[model samples]
Target chain A: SSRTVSYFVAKPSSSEMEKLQLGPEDSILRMERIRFADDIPICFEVASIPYSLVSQYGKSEITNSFYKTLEAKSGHKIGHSNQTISAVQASEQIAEYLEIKRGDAILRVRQVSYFENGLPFEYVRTQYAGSRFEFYLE
Target chain B: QNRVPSSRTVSYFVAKPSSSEMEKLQLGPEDSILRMERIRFADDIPICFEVASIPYSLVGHSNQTISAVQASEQIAEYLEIKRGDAILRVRQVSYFENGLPFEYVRTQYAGSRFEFYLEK
Candidate 1:
C-alpha cells in the first residue's frame, strides 16, 4: 500500500539552483511525485537534478528510483543529506491532492542529498499533509 | 550566531510508556519512564515546548534531526503560537555512537522566533 508516483518534467527555483550549486548555464531536470501510504495521499514532492547526471538514462530508469539511477550513473552511493524543516499552510492545489483543507497545517521539508564523494545529487522539497505524515529519523 | 539557553520545567511524572514511546524507548510493558515537560528559551524569548522521555534509571543525549509537525494546544501556549500552526519538531535520540538508547526528546519550535543553524 506504499507507493511513489513520479514524472520527469520541467525544473528548480532559483533558491534550489543555489543549493544545487549550479551555474547559470547548467541544464537540470525537475521531477515531481506524490507519495502514498495505504492508498491515501501523504505528500507531494518536487526535486531537481542536473540533467547531465542522468542524460544517458531513460525516463523509466530514473522514474523507477532516482537514487538507484543516480548511483548507477555516478558509481557512487548516496551517503548523506542535510535538510531544513518548517511548517506552512496548504495551498489549494496541495490541499486537493492531499485531501486536506486550504490553510490547514502542512509540513514542508527542503533537502539536498549527497553522494559518497560529497557531490550534491538532488535537491527536493516535499509538502506533507500534517494529518498523514511525520518524518522519522533513525 | 548563538544565544544563551534556559528552560523552565512545566511538569514531571513517572509512568509507563505509551505505545509509540514504548517502541522508541525500547521499554518493556512494565518498565517505568520519567516524562519531563519544559518550556525552553533562547535568551528570554520562548522558543521550544518539549517533552522528554527517559528510562527510569537512564537519561542521556547526539544525532540531530528535524521534522515538521503541527503544534499541539499545550505546545502552542508554551511556544506562544496558536494551535494548528506548523512547527519545527526536532527529535534527538541520545545514545553513544550506535550504543544503547538512552533518551528520547521531542521539541516543538516556533519557527519565526528562532534563527538556528547546524553543521556536520
Candidate 2:
C-alpha cells in the first residue's frame, strides 16, 4: 500500500480580502528594494487604489507614502532597484529601467491588478529618489 | 536644605492594542501610525514586539494594562532591581499592519532608569 501527502492553502478571507482593499482600480505593490532616509534600505508592502474608492470604502486615510497615494490616484503600480556601482549587476535590470546609477538608492515596487472576478489583470514597477523620499505602510 | 539620594525615570514599553486587534483595525493609507501609539518614545528605538488581537472580554483594558506592567516588571526582575524602587516607564506605542507604523504614541516615565557613568 502507498500513501499520498497533500497540503492545503489558506485562501484570503473576505475580511482578509477586504483588508487587501481590492477594487476595480486597486493594486498591490511589493517593494523588492527601496532607498529612503539617505539611501538606507526602505522596504515594505503596500496596497494602492483610487482616492474616491478609499474615501468611500476604505477604513483609514491615505497618508503614509506619497508614491503609494499617487499610484492609487493614477491607478498604477511601481517598483525600483539598487545599483551601487556604475557597472551593471544582474539585478540592476530593475534599476536600469528606472534610469538610475548602479547601486543607487531605489525602491523596487510591484503592482498586481485584479479583474472583476478577482483575477490579476496587470503589473507595474517604478523607482524613485531615495534621498528625497520615504515609504511606510501599516 | 539637605539633599536626598534620589532619581526618577522609568523605561518600559507602552500598553498597546494586541497585534490581533491591530490587524482588525483598518488603517487608510494616510492614517498616522501615531494614533495607535500608546506612547511615542519607543518610536525611534529598534526593538519591536508582536501581540495577538483578542476580544475585549479575553483581555480587558485592566488586564491589558496589567500585562504591560508585568512586562516591565519582568524586565526589572531580570535586572534584579527592587520592584517598587525601580520605575517602569511606558515609553511609546507603535502598531502596524505588516511591520509599518500605522499607530504610534509617546509617554513619559515617572522616573529614570539606572545609569552607569564613566569619568572623562
Candidate 3:
C-alpha cells in the first residue's frame, strides 16, 4: 500500500532556500510518502512546495498529488519541468522509509516544475529502488 | 588526479532479430538490426557497460559490424570487481533529425564508480 508519512511546514536549508528563491522568513511545506507495488516498496518521495502557494490547503489536500492541488488552487496549468537522474547509496533514513538496507543502491530523481507563467512552484526528490525501476529517456 | 581518457571496447556486434527487440524497435521479425555491447574504461578502470541496438535501416555501413571485444566475465576480471556489483541502468531512445527513431541504448554504470550529473 502507498501512504503519506509526514506533511508539515518547515524551514528549508540555506541552499534549498536559494534554489527556491525564498526569503529567509518564508516557510516550506514538506511531504514524504512511500509507494509500493505488489506489496513491495518501489519508491520513496519527498516533495517541497513554497508555503505561500499551499498555505490554504489542508492535510488531506496536500497528501495526494500536489501538482493537481496546486493547479486547482491557482487556476494555472503546469507548463513544463526540468529534471535530473543519478545513482546514490541509500542513507539510513531513506533505507528505513524504503525498506531497503543502508548502502543499497537507489536511483534519485530531482525535478522542478513551473507554472504557465514561468513561476517555479515545486521541488521534489524521489528515490527509487534500483532493482525495481528503470527510467526511459528521449 | 587528472581525468583519464575514456576508451570503448566492443565486446559483441551482430545483426540479429529477436521477438522482444522487434517489438521495442517496431520492426518485423525478419528485419535486421544491429546489436552491440561494450564496456567503457577510465584510465583502464572499467566504469560502464552498454548494450545498444539500431534498426539496420538507419545506420551507415561503418556501423554494420565490429570485431575485438571482451566478454562480461573477462571485463569483470579486468576491473578487479565482483560479478554482482551494483550497476545503475539507464535506457534511452534517440531520434534522428527528422523525428525518426535512431537507436535504443541501455547503459549500466558501476554505481560505486560513477554518478550522472546534469543542470539546465
> Highest TM-score, which number?
1
Model 1 lDDT, full chain set = 0.75
Candidate 1 CAPRI classification by DockQ: acceptable
List iRMS (one decimal) for every candidate.
3.9, 21.9, 9.1
Native contact share for candidate 3: 0.16
lDDT of 3 by residue, A1-138 (tens): 788888889998775586677877889998888999998888899888889888988777777666678777778888877776766767888889888887676778788877878877778888987766766443
**Per-residue lDDT of candidate 1, residues B1-120 (tens digit):** 399999999999999988767877877879889999998888988888888988897743455556566667877788888887777777777775566677888888875334233222
Q: Estimate each model's TM-score.
A: 0.73, 0.21, 0.68
Interface RMSD of 1: 3.9
Tens digit of lDDT per residue, candidate 1, span A1-138? 334455554454677668877776676777778878877888888878877787888877777666777666768888878876677878899888787888777778778877778777788888898767666654
> Which regions of candidate 1 are displaced past 4 Å?
A1-12, A74-80, A114-119, B13-34, B54-66, B91-104, B112-120
Error of 2 at A115 (Å): 1.9
**Candidate with more favorable, higher DockQ: 2 or 3:** 3
Chain A TM-scores of all predicted models: 0.85, 0.29, 0.90
Q: Number of clashing residue pairs in every model? A: 0, 45, 0
Clash number for candidate 2: 45
DockQ of candidate 1 against the true complex: 0.29
